[PDB]
């Protein structure tokens, strides 16, 4: 139990190190409680352009998002390495866990940056409106909506970084990823992680009953989003011609249901 | 297959 508490603390601490923008910080900015200036608002084309602190509209946003999606994968890999037992695993299984886990964690943590009307960008320096991202052509104006939809559902659980540190370790340590060689040692780690999450939720949220259950239910909603996001990529395969995909994102998306 | 960069992230850490 002191084991369970110390594992919560350690996860929390590396979470702080790995991820430059926490939910606390995002929340303080989003609710106007900050002091730390106020983000530049992007609600259209001209505001996108003045928001400066190469090609076509929706493509520009697409490519931008790619630099930060790469960076997010780097951050999450850093963080995964900190999960006790992770770097003790077979090297191919480590890759698999990341390969399949990273999207689910991006979506989860992207909620932290969202309200129903928009999203923080440039680590809190910017605010891009939901309606604007929706105004992009083709398959591009349909990428964010199911994220906002999920963020509204997920944010009502009212988790803080302490909770989230553990939840994302749980997601990474999923023994049910395809092509995994040694399932057992992954599931023994996750078992342990679920016990720390369960105790963490009880103590930090003593009045919000069955939160544990409800959080775990969100794992079906995360995986539908992943499913959807990939089908939208497959539309950018044919519909769009010259569209540089980043090598890291390529190997992430190569052979993934 | 192979996953050059992931292997390399797991091994070298980031970037600066
Ligand atoms: C500046 C780009 C605006 C896009 C939405 C805001 C973001 C995006 C951050 C990470 C990208 C989230 C997209 C989900 C997975 C990306 C993989 C892909 O590029 O298809 N943000 O961090 O604030």
Tab-separated table of C-alpha atoms and ligand atoms in Angstrom:
chain	number	residue	atom	x	y	z
A	1	UNK	CA	0.000	0.000	0.000
A	2	UNK	CA	2.955	2.228	0.819
A	3	UNK	CA	4.337	0.406	-2.229
A	4	UNK	CA	1.151	1.517	-4.077
A	5	UNK	CA	1.476	5.104	-2.836
A	6	UNK	CA	5.160	5.292	-3.735
A	7	UNK	CA	4.392	4.000	-7.227
A	8	UNK	CA	1.720	6.774	-7.611
A	9	UNK	CA	4.251	9.446	-6.493
A	10	UNK	CA	7.005	8.129	-8.824
A	11	UNK	CA	4.591	8.031	-11.828
A	12	UNK	CA	3.422	11.564	-10.936
A	13	UNK	CA	7.016	12.857	-10.636
A	14	UNK	CA	8.115	11.497	-14.062
A	15	UNK	CA	4.869	12.666	-15.584
A	16	UNK	CA	5.864	16.235	-14.415
A	17	UNK	CA	9.303	15.819	-16.003
A	18	UNK	CA	8.093	14.357	-19.288
A	19	UNK	CA	5.113	16.589	-20.026
A	20	UNK	CA	5.746	20.388	-20.201
A	21	UNK	CA	2.056	21.338	-19.898
A	22	UNK	CA	0.091	19.853	-17.041
A	23	UNK	CA	-3.756	19.805	-16.622
A	24	UNK	CA	-3.399	22.208	-13.646
A	25	UNK	CA	-1.608	24.726	-15.849
A	26	UNK	CA	-3.878	24.152	-18.881
A	27	UNK	CA	-6.914	24.498	-16.528
A	28	UNK	CA	-5.687	27.775	-15.011
A	29	UNK	CA	-5.147	29.213	-18.489
A	30	UNK	CA	-8.496	27.924	-19.852
A	31	UNK	CA	-10.477	29.289	-16.901
A	32	UNK	CA	-8.827	32.789	-16.933
A	33	UNK	CA	-7.232	32.254	-13.542
A	34	UNK	CA	-3.615	32.529	-14.718
A	35	UNK	CA	-1.755	35.901	-14.521
A	36	UNK	CA	0.487	34.395	-17.271
A	37	UNK	CA	-0.666	36.732	-20.021
A	38	UNK	CA	-3.494	35.321	-22.158
A	39	UNK	CA	-3.146	33.044	-25.240
A	40	UNK	CA	-3.415	34.353	-28.828
A	41	UNK	CA	-6.806	33.263	-30.234
A	42	UNK	CA	-6.989	31.561	-33.620
A	43	UNK	CA	-10.492	31.586	-35.035
A	44	UNK	CA	-9.699	32.013	-38.711
A	45	UNK	CA	-7.156	32.377	-41.477
A	46	UNK	CA	-5.888	35.890	-40.744
A	47	UNK	CA	-5.678	35.133	-36.997
A	48	UNK	CA	-3.813	31.914	-37.885
A	49	UNK	CA	-1.349	34.127	-39.788
A	50	UNK	CA	-0.889	36.802	-37.064
A	51	UNK	CA	-0.461	33.839	-34.676
A	52	UNK	CA	3.270	33.812	-35.486
A	53	UNK	CA	5.576	33.869	-32.471
A	54	UNK	CA	4.756	27.186	-47.233
A	55	UNK	CA	1.805	25.520	-49.007
A	56	UNK	CA	-1.963	25.269	-48.355
A	57	UNK	CA	-4.402	26.055	-45.496
A	58	UNK	CA	-5.552	22.686	-44.071
A	59	UNK	CA	-2.174	21.151	-44.979
A	60	UNK	CA	-0.348	23.802	-42.920
A	61	UNK	CA	-2.381	22.930	-39.813
A	62	UNK	CA	-1.874	19.231	-40.670
A	63	UNK	CA	1.951	19.638	-40.819
A	64	UNK	CA	2.100	21.842	-37.707
A	65	UNK	CA	0.190	19.205	-35.731
A	66	UNK	CA	2.800	16.698	-36.996
A	67	UNK	CA	5.833	18.383	-35.417
A	68	UNK	CA	3.953	18.263	-32.053
A	69	UNK	CA	2.620	14.749	-32.503
A	70	UNK	CA	6.221	13.626	-33.040
A	71	UNK	CA	7.271	15.569	-29.925
A	72	UNK	CA	4.416	13.959	-27.964
A	73	UNK	CA	5.650	10.444	-28.997
A	74	UNK	CA	9.123	11.418	-27.746
A	75	UNK	CA	7.648	12.619	-24.430
A	76	UNK	CA	5.517	9.498	-23.998
A	77	UNK	CA	8.475	7.203	-24.775
A	78	UNK	CA	10.529	9.046	-22.182
A	79	UNK	CA	7.686	8.554	-19.699
A	80	UNK	CA	7.102	4.845	-20.588
A	81	UNK	CA	10.741	4.118	-19.827
A	82	UNK	CA	10.065	5.336	-16.257
A	83	UNK	CA	7.282	2.777	-15.613
A	84	UNK	CA	8.943	0.172	-13.381
A	85	UNK	CA	9.287	-3.084	-15.321
A	86	UNK	CA	8.877	-1.502	-18.789
A	87	UNK	CA	12.572	-1.439	-19.821
A	88	UNK	CA	12.911	-4.982	-18.425
A	89	UNK	CA	10.554	-6.190	-21.174
A	90	UNK	CA	11.510	-7.662	-24.526
A	91	UNK	CA	12.605	-4.863	-26.864
A	92	UNK	CA	10.004	-5.718	-29.600
A	93	UNK	CA	7.181	-5.719	-27.025
A	94	UNK	CA	8.357	-2.309	-25.790
A	95	UNK	CA	8.028	-0.991	-29.357
A	96	UNK	CA	4.590	-2.639	-29.761
A	97	UNK	CA	3.318	-1.089	-26.471
A	98	UNK	CA	4.403	2.333	-27.727
A	99	UNK	CA	3.221	1.740	-31.284
A	100	UNK	CA	-0.349	0.960	-30.106
A	101	UNK	CA	-0.381	2.991	-26.861
A	102	UNK	CA	0.715	6.410	-27.993
A	103	UNK	CA	-2.591	7.486	-29.768
A	104	UNK	CA	-4.705	6.539	-26.775
A	105	UNK	CA	-2.463	8.619	-24.502
A	106	UNK	CA	-2.382	11.555	-26.922
A	107	UNK	CA	-6.192	11.653	-26.931
A	108	UNK	CA	-6.404	11.343	-23.158
A	109	UNK	CA	-3.923	14.197	-22.579
A	110	UNK	CA	-5.296	16.315	-25.382
A	111	UNK	CA	-8.519	16.454	-23.300
A	112	UNK	CA	-6.509	18.387	-20.642
A	113	UNK	CA	-5.954	21.127	-23.263
A	114	UNK	CA	-9.563	21.284	-24.326
A	115	UNK	CA	-12.811	22.839	-23.388
A	116	UNK	CA	-15.870	22.518	-25.659
A	117	UNK	CA	-15.003	25.612	-27.653
A	118	UNK	CA	-11.301	25.116	-28.323
A	119	UNK	CA	-7.814	23.839	-27.644
A	120	UNK	CA	-4.546	25.181	-26.224
A	121	UNK	CA	-1.615	25.068	-28.562
A	122	UNK	CA	2.054	26.161	-28.313
A	123	UNK	CA	1.992	24.807	-24.766
A	124	UNK	CA	-0.638	27.310	-23.541
A	125	UNK	CA	0.532	30.293	-25.663
A	126	UNK	CA	-2.321	29.842	-28.100
A	127	UNK	CA	-5.997	29.061	-28.253
A	128	UNK	CA	-7.445	27.503	-31.450
A	129	UNK	CA	-11.256	27.380	-31.731
A	130	UNK	CA	-13.154	24.135	-32.355
A	131	UNK	CA	-15.315	25.787	-35.051
A	132	UNK	CA	-12.208	26.897	-36.925
A	133	UNK	CA	-10.556	23.453	-37.002
A	134	UNK	CA	-13.990	22.321	-38.227
A	135	UNK	CA	-13.824	24.794	-41.144
A	136	UNK	CA	-10.982	22.972	-42.904
A	137	UNK	CA	-11.667	21.153	-46.165
A	138	UNK	CA	-11.892	17.511	-47.042
A	139	UNK	CA	-10.874	15.035	-44.310
A	140	UNK	CA	-9.053	17.753	-42.325
A	141	UNK	CA	-12.046	19.532	-40.769
A	142	UNK	CA	-13.157	16.176	-39.355
A	143	UNK	CA	-10.043	15.175	-37.460
A	144	UNK	CA	-10.625	17.167	-34.214
A	145	UNK	CA	-14.368	16.872	-33.600
A	146	UNK	CA	-14.383	13.331	-32.204
A	147	UNK	CA	-11.523	14.475	-29.898
A	148	UNK	CA	-13.537	17.401	-28.533
A	149	UNK	CA	-16.593	15.083	-28.250
A	150	UNK	CA	-14.499	12.631	-26.183
A	151	UNK	CA	-12.741	15.441	-24.168
A	152	UNK	CA	-16.204	16.722	-23.031
A	153	UNK	CA	-17.145	13.219	-21.852
A	154	UNK	CA	-13.684	12.578	-20.289
A	155	UNK	CA	-13.208	15.970	-18.598
A	156	UNK	CA	-16.394	15.461	-16.550
A	157	UNK	CA	-14.556	12.781	-14.578
A	158	UNK	CA	-12.453	15.720	-13.250
A	159	UNK	CA	-9.162	13.808	-12.989
A	160	UNK	CA	-6.044	15.641	-12.069
A	161	UNK	CA	-2.449	14.979	-13.085
A	162	UNK	CA	-1.962	12.574	-10.143
A	163	UNK	CA	-4.785	10.376	-11.492
A	164	UNK	CA	-3.704	10.816	-15.110
A	165	UNK	CA	-0.033	9.799	-14.414
A	166	UNK	CA	-1.273	6.366	-13.419
A	167	UNK	CA	-4.054	6.037	-16.030
A	168	UNK	CA	-1.644	6.521	-18.936
A	169	UNK	CA	0.799	3.876	-17.496
A	170	UNK	CA	-2.219	1.546	-17.443
A	171	UNK	CA	-2.952	2.263	-21.135
A	172	UNK	CA	0.730	1.665	-22.155
A	173	UNK	CA	0.836	-1.664	-20.241
A	174	UNK	CA	-1.959	-3.309	-22.231
A	175	UNK	CA	-1.323	-6.999	-22.680
A	176	UNK	CA	-3.844	-7.154	-25.508
A	177	UNK	CA	-1.829	-5.291	-28.178
A	178	UNK	CA	-1.504	-7.348	-31.394
A	179	UNK	CA	1.805	-9.207	-32.082
A	180	UNK	CA	2.918	-9.071	-28.452
A	181	UNK	CA	5.342	-11.878	-27.605
A	182	UNK	CA	5.286	-11.959	-23.793
A	183	UNK	CA	1.852	-10.981	-22.589
A	184	UNK	CA	2.227	-12.256	-19.014
A	185	UNK	CA	4.918	-9.847	-17.707
A	186	UNK	CA	3.023	-6.859	-19.220
A	187	UNK	CA	-0.235	-7.945	-17.517
A	188	UNK	CA	1.575	-8.379	-14.150
A	189	UNK	CA	2.812	-4.782	-14.429
A	190	UNK	CA	-0.708	-3.498	-15.370
A	191	UNK	CA	-2.297	-5.443	-12.555
A	192	UNK	CA	-0.020	-3.570	-10.188
A	193	UNK	CA	-0.778	-0.247	-11.958
A	194	UNK	CA	-4.535	-0.879	-11.667
A	195	UNK	CA	-4.179	-1.399	-7.930
A	196	UNK	CA	-2.394	1.991	-7.572
A	197	UNK	CA	-4.957	3.661	-9.781
A	198	UNK	CA	-7.784	2.121	-7.711
A	199	UNK	CA	-6.268	3.350	-4.417
A	200	UNK	CA	-5.320	6.725	-5.962
A	201	UNK	CA	-8.970	7.309	-7.128
A	202	UNK	CA	-10.511	6.245	-3.786
A	203	UNK	CA	-8.316	8.689	-1.822
A	204	UNK	CA	-8.176	11.627	-4.216
A	205	UNK	CA	-11.881	11.400	-5.156
A	206	UNK	CA	-13.609	9.841	-2.148
A	207	UNK	CA	-17.097	11.066	-3.024
A	208	UNK	CA	-17.143	10.264	-6.753
A	209	UNK	CA	-18.359	6.709	-6.636
A	210	UNK	CA	-17.311	4.019	-9.136
A	211	UNK	CA	-14.847	6.467	-10.688
A	212	UNK	CA	-12.429	3.637	-11.204
A	213	UNK	CA	-15.070	1.691	-13.266
A	214	UNK	CA	-16.031	4.863	-15.209
A	215	UNK	CA	-12.436	5.642	-16.106
A	216	UNK	CA	-11.877	2.111	-17.339
A	217	UNK	CA	-15.104	2.450	-19.393
A	218	UNK	CA	-13.422	5.399	-21.174
A	219	UNK	CA	-10.924	2.886	-22.652
A	220	UNK	CA	-13.677	1.809	-25.138
A	221	UNK	CA	-14.185	5.394	-26.148
A	222	UNK	CA	-10.436	5.966	-26.579
A	223	UNK	CA	-10.131	2.930	-28.852
A	224	UNK	CA	-13.067	3.909	-31.138
A	225	UNK	CA	-11.288	7.261	-31.669
A	226	UNK	CA	-8.054	5.515	-32.609
A	227	UNK	CA	-10.023	3.318	-35.043
A	228	UNK	CA	-11.641	6.447	-36.636
A	229	UNK	CA	-8.418	8.458	-36.809
A	230	UNK	CA	-6.713	5.705	-38.906
A	231	UNK	CA	-9.611	5.437	-41.408
A	232	UNK	CA	-9.293	9.219	-41.909
A	233	UNK	CA	-5.575	8.749	-42.614
A	234	UNK	CA	-6.465	6.115	-45.258
A	235	UNK	CA	-8.563	8.821	-46.946
A	236	UNK	CA	-5.480	11.101	-47.065
A	237	UNK	CA	-3.667	8.192	-48.803
A	238	UNK	CA	-5.705	8.438	-52.042
A	239	UNK	CA	-7.424	11.841	-51.847
A	240	UNK	CA	-4.170	13.754	-51.204
A	241	UNK	CA	-1.080	13.593	-53.418
A	242	UNK	CA	2.135	15.229	-52.105
A	243	UNK	CA	1.669	15.113	-48.354
A	244	UNK	CA	4.902	14.465	-46.415
A	245	UNK	CA	4.280	12.078	-43.509
A	246	UNK	CA	7.020	12.093	-40.809
A	247	UNK	CA	9.149	8.870	-40.689
A	248	UNK	CA	8.404	8.375	-36.995
A	249	UNK	CA	4.668	8.711	-37.752
A	250	UNK	CA	5.014	6.370	-40.757
A	251	UNK	CA	6.501	3.541	-38.648
A	252	UNK	CA	3.891	4.241	-35.977
A	253	UNK	CA	1.101	3.895	-38.607
A	254	UNK	CA	2.641	1.068	-40.710
A	255	UNK	CA	0.671	-2.121	-40.025
A	256	UNK	CA	-1.868	-0.984	-37.413
A	257	UNK	CA	-5.327	-2.554	-37.894
B	1	UNK	CA	8.836	-3.468	-39.566
B	2	UNK	CA	12.229	-2.609	-37.894
B	3	UNK	CA	11.119	0.713	-36.315
B	4	UNK	CA	14.445	2.628	-36.596
B	5	UNK	CA	13.296	5.661	-34.634
B	6	UNK	CA	11.308	4.055	-31.867
B	7	UNK	CA	14.205	1.709	-31.063
B	8	UNK	CA	16.380	4.860	-31.100
B	9	UNK	CA	14.010	6.822	-28.856
B	10	UNK	CA	13.983	3.907	-26.367
B	11	UNK	CA	17.770	3.853	-26.500
B	12	UNK	CA	19.049	7.426	-26.916
B	13	UNK	CA	16.189	9.387	-25.344
B	14	UNK	CA	15.119	12.510	-27.289
B	15	UNK	CA	16.394	15.341	-29.092
B	16	UNK	CA	17.431	18.411	-27.101
C	1	LIG	C1	-1.072	23.150	-33.870
C	1	LIG	C2	-1.831	21.956	-34.391
C	1	LIG	C3	-3.315	21.989	-34.022
C	1	LIG	C4	-3.913	20.606	-33.873
C	1	LIG	C5	-4.598	20.378	-32.526
C	1	LIG	C6	-3.748	20.730	-31.326
C	1	LIG	C7	-2.703	20.021	-30.879
C	1	LIG	C8	-2.212	18.732	-31.514
C	1	LIG	C9	-1.249	17.939	-30.650
C	1	LIG	C10	-0.933	16.710	-31.013
C	1	LIG	C11	-1.576	16.211	-32.276
C	1	LIG	C12	-2.926	15.551	-31.999
C	1	LIG	C13	-3.441	14.758	-33.179
C	1	LIG	C14	-3.683	13.330	-32.780
C	1	LIG	C15	-2.617	12.382	-33.320
C	1	LIG	C16	-1.703	13.039	-34.338
C	1	LIG	C17	-1.214	12.106	-35.431
C	1	LIG	C18	-1.417	12.721	-36.798
C	1	LIG	O1	-0.769	13.724	-37.133
C	1	LIG	O2	-2.232	12.221	-37.582
C	1	LIG	N1	-2.090	20.491	-29.821
C	1	LIG	O3	-1.145	19.941	-29.345
C	1	LIG	O4	-2.447	21.475	-29.289
